[PDB]
Structure formats: C-alpha cells, structure tokens
Amino acid sequence: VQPHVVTVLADTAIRADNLDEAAILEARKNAEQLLANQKSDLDSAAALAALAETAAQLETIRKIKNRAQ
Amino acid sequence: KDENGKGRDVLLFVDNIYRYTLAGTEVSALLGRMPSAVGYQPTLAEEMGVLQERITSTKSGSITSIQAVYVPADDLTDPSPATTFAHLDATVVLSRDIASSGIYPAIDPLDSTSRQ
C-alpha cells in the first residue's frame, strides 16, 4: 500500500464471495483442459495422418516414370 | 590347343551389343515380317540366344565376356535389355541421376549383382 496506490500480488484470487465459488474456477480450468485435449485431437489427427499417407505409395510411381510399355 | 597343353584364356570385349538388335530391327519389317509387340522383330530372342550361347567357356579354353549394353530411354524393361539380361552372371547398371550427382563411377549399388 502507498498513500495513493494499493495493490495485491495474488497467489490466486477470483472475483467471488466465498470459496463456494470454487465450483466456478474449475469451469475455466476444465474449459482450458478441453482445449488442451482438442489441440492434440486435431494436431495428430490432421498432421500425422495425412502426411503419413502422402509419401506412402509414391515410390511405385517414381519408378515407372519412363515406361514405354 | 596350347603348345603342349590346353589353350590360353580368352579376353573378349564387345561394344554396344544392343546395336546388333537395332541392326536386325532396321530390316525386320523389310523381311515382310509383321511387327512384334513393339517395332522390334518377334524373332528377337532367337538371334539373341544364338549369339549369346556362342560365348560360353568349354572344357577347352576359357572366354571372358565383357559387354556394354545401351539402354534405350533409360528403360531397363524395354524388351531388348530385359531379354539380354538373363545371359549374364554379373550385372552392372549405371544410373543417370547419380552421374548427374557427379559421382564416378555412377554404378548403382542396388541393382548391380554377381552370381559369385
């Protein structure tokens, strides 16, 4: 506190009336948790898969390039 | 026959055996023969073999055959390279890209084989 500015460096605080509002902080907690699930659920599923099939069967083409018969 | 013994070995070296097949091709049509699966002559294998079998080493004498084989359009599986192919113990093929990569000799490590 200063005669003109006061502040609190919060270890953890929530705009709330009581610890009963713990039912509210977990809402954002699990929200970000769900997002953390989502980032993987897309990342590997999109990137790893499609890129896996990309280079997969290309060889049989590159070997038959100059085929005259 | 060697003087008092079996003959000295034979060093044989041939350039562009494929040109033989090409020469046959040049007239194959003019013989009234219909074209083979490609413009090649359908006789191809026979005149190939009669050539090839005259190269084996016998009880008398030994012949060392070296043959450079042109590859049309770098197509290893044109009829002529494939058909020729079954008459050699040692296989040595060059790859255009590897030479384009600057290496000499440009011998493919992969395809080139030897029955030994």
Side-chain angles (χ1 to χ4, degrees):
Chain A
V1 62
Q2 295 211 355
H4 296 285
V5 58
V6 68
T7 187
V8 64
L9 295 163
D11 184 3
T12 299
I14 297 89
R15 189 83 59 118
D17 79 331
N18 174 269
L19 73 164
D20 54 2
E21 304 317 278
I24 312 305
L25 58 87
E26 183 178 2
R28 67 184 184 273
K29 283 215 155 212
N30 289 337
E32 190 276 331
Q33 182 277 330
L34 171 63
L35 187 151
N37 191 21
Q38 179 65 258
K39 62 175 285 297
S40 66
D41 296 333
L42 294 147
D43 187 301
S44 66
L48 276 290
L51 310 173
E53 293 84 4
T54 48
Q57 294 82 17
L58 186 49
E59 176 41 57
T60 176
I61 297 89
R62 314 169 267 215
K63 64 143 201 173
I64 62 181
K65 176 145 46 187
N66 286 293
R67 285 305 307 108
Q69 213 186 29
Chain B
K1 289 300 303 308
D2 171 22
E3 189 180 8
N4 313 324
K6 274 186 170 184
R8 293 182 183 174
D9 291 331
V10 181
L11 299 200
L12 161 73
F13 313 93
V14 190
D15 192 345
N16 283 331
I17 175 171
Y18 152 84
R19 289 305 194 280
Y20 181 76
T21 46
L22 202 49
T25 312
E26 286 179 271
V27 66
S28 304
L30 277 296
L31 272 192
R33 317 170 153 182
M34 275 70 84
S36 69
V38 176
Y40 301 73
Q41 63 272 6
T43 72
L44 170 62
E46 187 71 81
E47 64 266 21
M48 293 177 70
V50 61
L51 161 60
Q52 285 330 111
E53 303 270 31
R54 297 181 55 147
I55 319 173
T56 177
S57 291
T58 62
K59 331 291 185 43
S60 88
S62 68
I63 318 166
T64 69
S65 79
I66 322 295
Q67 293 177 335
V69 177
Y70 161 69
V71 182
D74 276 7
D75 201 13
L76 290 88
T77 187
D78 284 336
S80 70
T83 314
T84 47
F85 183 76
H87 306 66
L88 296 158
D89 297 329
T91 70
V92 182
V93 56
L94 306 181
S95 64
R96 183 161 296 306
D97 54 355
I98 306 188
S100 87
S101 178
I103 298 91
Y104 289 92
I107 305 155
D108 174 18
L110 189 154
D111 307 336
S112 285
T113 75
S114 170
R115 301 303 58 65
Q116 304 306 109

